[PDB]
């Protein structure tokens, strides 16, 4: 019925390695039908991509022009994306589009803006300027030169849609693995909880500090050196503020924020980065079945109220604190 060693198909998709991992014998085919809807979603929300044939980049052509009809992935996307904006503290917004774009943070192009750029696009930033249609399936930028960017949400939403597809074929043990989103479905076969690696901030990709036991579980990742630019002495990492168009710089190097569902991961990472390690904490700490593990400049590791004791740290250069 389950499989020690599973199934595995790996691509290098939205700029990172994605693996899915089933253990369920008969399952194979399910791997492929999963990277199907990736590559579908991926293609529909990108405004990485040249040919332009994506929604989103339909969209943004068309800001402050006419209303553009989209599909139900992308209408529920930006629904959900407007929601978080709304909920954040000024500290997340969709329409980030045009300052993500001029930065450029994790292309080979990425630059560090002049000023005077970065004074022409913040009036540009506002999702109250998103007009939905539910009746016609429209969005329209009210404003010329308004860009949607969905990259801070995308990878959580298909991270979900994949689980979804895993569940609609009665996959029941499983790893989704898209870089900073893990989503754990079941136990390992041997009957214990997943072991999700934790990243270590200050190293690359699959580094990690320690380990969290987890069964049916999202982790979602953010770091200081997660996608950044150096220039001149000095790193640039992509949460940027959409109020000053530059980094949100504090005490925190990476946070793991731990869920049910990968698009609240998502959705919640720049608010709760925004606000340090002591202010993200208490962020957190509102949200019921939201907890998190943040990680210090200083080498220091915090677990929030829920997830007391159950970090195994691994990594002698980290300290445990509260």
Not at 56 to 79: C, F, H, M, R, T
Not at 221 to 244: N, Q
């Amino acid at each position: 019925k389950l499989m020690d060693q599973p199934y595995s198909k790996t691509d290098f998709l939205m700029g990172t390695v994605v693996t899915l991992k089933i253990y369920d014998k008969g399952k194979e085919d399910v791997l492929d039908k999963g990277f199907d809807r990736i590559k579908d979603l991926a293609a529909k929300i990108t405004t990485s991509d040249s040919e332009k044939t994506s929604e989103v980049d339909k969209i943004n052509e068309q800001a402050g022009k006419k209303p553009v009809k989209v599909s139900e992935d992308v209408y529920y996307l930006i629904q959900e994306g407007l929601k978080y904006s709304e909920n954040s503290g000024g500290s997340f917004d969709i329409t980030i589009g045009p300052l993500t774009s001029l930065w450029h943070i994790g292309f080979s192009d990425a630059r560090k803006p002049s000023q005077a750029e970065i004074d022409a696009v913040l009036p540009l930033i506002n999702y109250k300027d998103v007009k939905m249609n539910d009746k016609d399936q429209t969005v329209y930028l009210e404003k010329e030169g308004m860009e949607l960017d969905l990259g801070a949400i995308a990878k959580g939403f298909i991270t979900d849609e994949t689980l979804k597809v895993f569940k609609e074929n009665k996959v029941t043990t499983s790893i989704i693995d898209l870089g900073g989103n893990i989503y754990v479905q079941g136990n390992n076969p041997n009957g214990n909880k997943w072991n999700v690696g934790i990243q270590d901030p200050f190293s690359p990709r699959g580094s990690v500090i320690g380990k969290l036991p987890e069964s049916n579980m999202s982790i979602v990742t953010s770091g200081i050196y997660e996608r950044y630019l150096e220039v001149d002495g000095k790193t640039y990492h992509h949460i940027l503020d959409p109020k000053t168009g530059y980094p949100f710089d504090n005490d925190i190097a990476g946070v793991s924020i731990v869920s049910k569902k990968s698009i609240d991961g998502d959705g919640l990472s720049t608010a709760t980065f925004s606000k340090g390690i002591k202010g993200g904490m208490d962020y957190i700490e509102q949200f019921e079945g939201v907890d998190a593990i943040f990680i210090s400049k200083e080498k220091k590791v915090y677990e929030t109220s829920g997830l007391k004791g159950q970090f195994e740290l691994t990594d002698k250069d980290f300290q445990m604190d509260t």
